[PDB]
Ligand binder design. Structure first.
Ligand code: HEM
Ligand code: HEM
Ligand code: HEM
Ligand code: HEM
Ligand code: HEM
Ligand code: HEM
Ligand code: HEM
Ligand SMILES: [Fe+3]
Ligand SMILES: [Fe+3]
Ligand SMILES: [Fe+3]
Ligand SMILES: [Fe+3]
Ligand SMILES: [Fe+3]
Ligand SMILES: [Fe+3]
Ligand SMILES: [Fe+3]
Ligand SMILES: [Fe+3]
Ligand SMILES: [Fe+3]
Ligand SMILES: [Fe+3]
Ligand SMILES: [Fe+3]
Ligand SMILES: [Fe+3]
Ligand SMILES: [Fe+3]
Ligand SMILES: [Fe+3]
Ligand SMILES: [Fe+3]
Ligand SMILES: [Fe+3]
Ligand SMILES: [Fe+3]
Ligand SMILES: [Fe+3]
Ligand SMILES: [Fe+3]
Ligand SMILES: [Fe+3]
Lengths: 159, 159, 159, 159, 159, 159, 159, 159, 159, 159
């Protein structure tokens, strides 16, 4: 069904944002695993897979609206070198994704594309749950120090 | 453990090749679904998820070798506009991936990094199964014509 | 609870649209069955039952807002005489229903009747999934021809 | 138990015929798989395994009659290059095997070796079922054309 | 995918070697059963069926590499007249098969056909397990004499 | 139904042969048990019961053809005094029974009594399996000596 | 089967290296248990038993190649007096074992003993997983300090 | 808890004895397997694992008494070249271990270290069961000859 | 049965020691629970119940030997005021109980009362396991500090 | 293994004592059953079977030490004629067996035969449990009179 070209542009901006988060979370998962924080690694792997579902919802919507989904390029990645910098990198990206979705929902609403608007608002609400998650981990790091925070989430040793 | 710099560069080239295949297969999956070839869409979703696991093997090995995995960029995507061009696009990409892993395995062997060599060889074997699959599909298209080939794989209608 | 009279008018327009789709899909189901395309018949029967649920949601909302639901009349039916004309008739009706729901959601939003607005937007999103379904079947008919498309969905012979 | 030398010669001719069919069917199975007709491939694999059982029954009978089973050589293979030529190659071989078994049963009967006669007649009846199978596939190819026949038996795509 | 001509010749030589082993082991199985060594017959039937799977791996790889698998001929069979000569016949054949796969793996490696190289190496390892088995049996025959060795493996009488 | 008198005479000769084998096998079973070869005893008991089924099939056929089954007399029994002589006695009887059945099948065939012919041929095939069994045991005794052969089949001690 | 003398010497050097690791890991396991780090003791017991299986693979291959496995002596043990020195002791030993297997695989390859080459490569890959594990533990100790690292792994108290 | 230094010296002598038996039994297990006596191989593997448990009990006791367990060195191994020499080698070692444990139990008793005394006496009783086992096998070899003894324990052939 | 009066005196000294440990452990369990270290509390409760079983074994033995078990009085209790002092109090008591049992076992041995001697030696071995437990906890407190040690064993909060 | 001759003499004295108790308990069981005290009969039957296990442990130990177990003769039996005399007869025998085992354990200890010493001490402890049992029954008879004691253990009447 022929979609609004500007809504399609917002959908493709969203897809880009999600692809970036998929890779940034997945890299951070494997970094956390390499550093030995296995419980934090398990959560990051789960967060990356949630973002993969988000990316998929954008590709499907773009195609339904007869647009061309662009998976060629990512936004710039922010790569930590400590557990605190991993948290802060992901938080900064999630804040930019939420702002994008807020913009895309308002735009879609203004042209009557209510199902696209609902997609952006559902994703906005999901990104606020990730922001809440990340802010909470940074608050722990503030109150307890990074060492006590990360030590709690080392996890169990493999068989 | 500090790895050979050149083996790490090959592993990063492989990572890029897999991330490209992941996005290329996923977009093709969703294009095939949008066109109504549900059985070919199932297969492409499965192939993409296989490539996801390959990408993850490269990230893991790069970190073990104290390299920086680079997920920032993809090789250029080849996007088909017909079922036949989807088949041809994926086959071109798999042929380049197979040659890259052949080269990476030979290089890793020449510096005694046998576990990196075995990762490239195992992946080279997997990509050959992909090539076999894609070549077989194109053969069916040559012998039967595209309409007969694609009609067989429309699949079942959703509840 | 006393509702906005204009929202109630949109609800009754929606009910009319749904009653029309229930009957048009059900007739097309039984036509597809009479022509022998049993797999297409099963899907049309399922689509008519989904529309019956839609009709029911409008009757319930109209009554809650102290309106009188009007089930007396249908919009004009479009009846195919070939599988292609069945697809095209249902697509044209679904396009008119989506536009109605878009209008009803915006109107309801403008008077603060948010639960009515949500009803219209949920139904708008459902109608876009039917449009996506129908467009896909027409695309198959375009790429493969009507005979190869319909032959795939003849289905199994009854015991 | 000392057998009739000429019956033993017919048994060894039969063994040769079966070894030839085992290999010809197995090669055709793997050809059909390489071309993508997976449902025809599954049936050819099953037919080759039935012939393996036939070969085994001849080796056992030859030994019981104190002969030397000769598995050194095959009759000439007929290798298709299209699905039609695969069907025709196997049919021609099955016609020669049936004639051999008919001859071996009559001979064995004429010297009173009734259990050998029963072996040849049981195998003759099995070969007529394969001939019936192959003739039927060629009849389909005649009435529908090779493309519609082979397209029906492409089968499902692997996980 | 077009393969190296010389790797394909090695794979066809391997195919011949496996088809020879299949028939040699199967005939030995049935000779051992005819002599009454039922436990040694069970083991030989199992070894033959292992070699069948090896033959099939070679047919599959030759076709993928767009070669013509040749199942027409076998290498010369070695047929024992005692349990000891059966052991010695099979061991001679396995030693020639192991050397052929060693050569094929080294050649495939030298042209970068690593998946064909890994097929020959995996089979070379399997043939070494066969050699180990057969050497062990001949050792028992040296230490205990053939009568004691073969008597242990007569097995149970059939219902 | 009135049968051919000569076929009935062959049926009664067969019945006599079977009664003889029932008793000869049963006596040898109990001899083998008394000497302590319990595994050979179990097999002889099973062989006698198979012959009892054979005897029964002759009594039923004779009656259907309105003959008088004669169970009054046995052929002369051959009673071993060693395990080797038991094997040789049963082999000599089985050779005479096979020749009788061969004669009875040919005769029945020559007068069109095909179901009687089938009975004799089915029994001929059964007797060749017993001959194969006995010949194999004698071959073991030849290659290993009687003591090693019989020792293997002493079996387990009763609770 | 007679093996290459130098490959057998490499396999015996590998056997010594594994027997050393078995005893070193087992003693460390029991020292960690004595100090009260029950979760680190579980992991070390598991690592020792992994090394036991490696030692056994070398004994088996040496005997197949008609060598004499030498279990008489170990390389010098490195015994830690703190959790950190246990980690460092095991990592030094694993780095020497990895280099030995790299050398053994390259030598076995150069004489065409591919199954011995594959045993060294598989073990070289396993030792790299050990190295990864140990390096990760030392990283946690650098980032968190030894007290925080070791406290996390005290584990549960026994019933 | 600070132990008696001489008891600790006996514990470490015991540990040495057990390490020696672990390796000597394990090597003999794999020798028996290479020669084809699989039932004797299974028992030797089980005996080596029992000795591994014995070794572990000494390491634990030494640490509890604040000694340093020494796993660096083994007593000299006795390696058979026939089944009889394997039995005799293990018997000679078990006789020396029993005498050691007898000495260690008496010593521990004389300084009041009753739990160490109980350890040595429990192990002494275990070693007498191994001696009883080995003496019995040598008695069989004496009464029956080595060939009949070893032939009984060849075991079953692997699938 | 009339026992040795001095053995009975040692049994009653033992009973006194056990009653003291029952109460000291139980009080410390409830102290640890009141301070919030629930995992340490669970272990102390379990240790007190083990000591209750020890006390019971002394009452039963005293009665069998026709003595009067004296449960009137306890040795002086040592009550901690910190987790470290709880560990040290229980260790000091366990050291005195082990010395008592060592004395009682030697005495009983010197008058031939072997079952009483076995009781004291079994209990001596049990007390060394408690000493090992307590020493290990003090070692943790030494290496990690009391705060990190006790924090690990706070346990879970009740429903 | 060659044992100490005097220990073997004590073992055979023990065996004699046990054989005597087996028969004395079994006779008393059947006497108690004949008099109608079925619950006392069940316990005596159980006590005789425990003594049978004791006798067996002595025969096994004597043989392991290369002695000749002597089961020819019993110590003199003491046969009651009332329930009180049955109790007193068994008590007197158990007192003599305990004294024997005490002597045998001390002797075995003095020559270092610790496993024999452990056997005598384990049996001494078992005999004290029987003495405790018998003394308790006599105490009941003293406090309640023989009639009230025996009446309680008449038991149930058989179906
Ligand atoms: C960084 C690149 C990526 C990596 C390393 C990656 C990794 C993976 C892995 C390893 C799994 C399987 C998880 C499991 O089975 O436990 C997975 C699942 C999935 N991925 Fe990816 N992925 C990547 C990119 C993508 C992209 C670009 C998309 C779609 C646009 C995608 C969509 C999915 C979906 C939808 C699933 C779940 C499939 C199912 O549950 O059926 N992922 N991902
Ligand atoms: C063309 C006129 C219609 C026809 C031919 C029709 C046919 C049917 C049939 C045969 C079923 C049962 C499906 C089954 O049990 O498999 C059904 C279910 C249903 N219909 Fe209708 N229907 C029609 C109009 C309506 C209308 C006007 C409504 C409400 C406004 C309605 C609401 C429902 C609902 C809600 C169900 C499912 C009931 C349940 O699952 O409990 N249908 N329809
Ligand atoms: C072209 C040469 C052959 C190939 C490629 C081949 C292939 C195989 C394969 C892959 C199987 C196992 C099928 C399964 O497990 O699904 C098999 C089974 C079997 N084959 Fe062969 N085979 C060949 C020649 C032989 C010969 C020469 C004989 C006997 C003369 C034989 C007798 C059997 C029998 C009897 C089975 C079934 C075994 C059972 O079910 O226990 N095959 N064949
Ligand atoms: C030597 C004279 C024979 C002896 C010692 C004998 C012994 C037996 C024994 C002990 C069984 C039962 C086997 C079991 O239950 O495990 C049996 C079964 C049988 N016997 Fe006989 N038999 C003799 C003669 C006959 C004759 C003359 C016939 C018929 C002509 C006969 C027909 C059968 C049949 C048909 C069964 C199996 C019955 C069933 O499975 O329902 N036997 N024989
Ligand atoms: C010759 C050197 C050794 C070899 C070849 C060896 C081999 C093995 C193998 C293959 C297993 C696992 C058995 C199974 O899972 O079936 C094992 C188990 C075991 N080994 Fe070793 N081992 C050796 C030395 C040691 C040493 C030095 C000790 C301790 C001092 C040890 C203690 C154990 C224990 C305690 C188990 C059983 C573990 C469990 O059941 O959880 N072994 N051994
Ligand atoms: C400090 C004085 C004691 C306290 C506070 C105490 C507490 C308890 C508690 C609460 C239980 C039940 C545990 C459960 O069911 O989870 C118990 C079990 C037991 N106690 Fe005591 N106890 C004390 C003294 C004794 C004494 C003096 C003895 C014997 C001399 C004794 C022997 C037992 C035995 C044998 C059990 C387990 C009973 C069974 O499992 O059947 N305790 N104790
Ligand atoms: C007075 C002479 C004896 C009599 C009347 C006797 C009676 C029995 C009875 C009737 C049983 C089976 C109990 C049951 O199945 O409920 C039995 C078991 C047993 N007896 Fe005897 N026995 C006697 C002497 C012996 C001797 C001399 C020994 C060994 C030296 C012996 C060792 C055993 C053993 C070990 C069992 C248990 C077997 C098992 O559980 O597998 N008994 N006794
Ligand atoms: Fe997202
Ligand atoms: Fe997010
Ligand atoms: Fe890949
Ligand atoms: Fe691929
Ligand atoms: Fe609707
Ligand atoms: Fe709709
Ligand atoms: Fe056939
Ligand atoms: Fe056929
Ligand atoms: Fe093979
Ligand atoms: Fe082989
Ligand atoms: Fe018969
Ligand atoms: Fe017969
Ligand atoms: Fe290792
Ligand atoms: Fe390791
Ligand atoms: Fe031991
Ligand atoms: Fe031992
Ligand atoms: Fe205690
Ligand atoms: Fe205690
Ligand atoms: Fe006793
Ligand atoms: Fe007793």
């Amino acid at each position: 069904m022929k979609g609004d070209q500007k809504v399609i542009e917002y959908l493709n901006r969203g897809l880009r944002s999600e692809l970036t988060a998929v890779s940034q979370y997945w890299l951070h998962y494997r970094m956390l695993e390499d550093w030995g924080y296995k419980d934090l690694a398990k959560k990051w792997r789960a967060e990356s897979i949630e973002e993969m579902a988000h990316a998929d919802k954008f590709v499907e919507r773009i195609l339904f609206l007869e647009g061309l989904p662009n998976l060629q390029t990512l936004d710039p990645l922010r790569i930590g070198q400590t557990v605190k910098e991993v948290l802060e990198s992901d938080l900064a990206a999630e804040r930019e994704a939420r702002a994008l979705y807020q913009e895309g929902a308002a735009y879609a609403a203004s042209v009557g594309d209510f199902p696209s608007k609902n997609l952006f608002e559902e994703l906005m609400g999901d990104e606020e749950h990730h922001i809440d998650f990340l802010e909470t981990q940074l608050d722990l790091v503030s109150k307890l120090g990074l060492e006590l925070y990360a030590q709690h989430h080392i996890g169990k040793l493999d068989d």
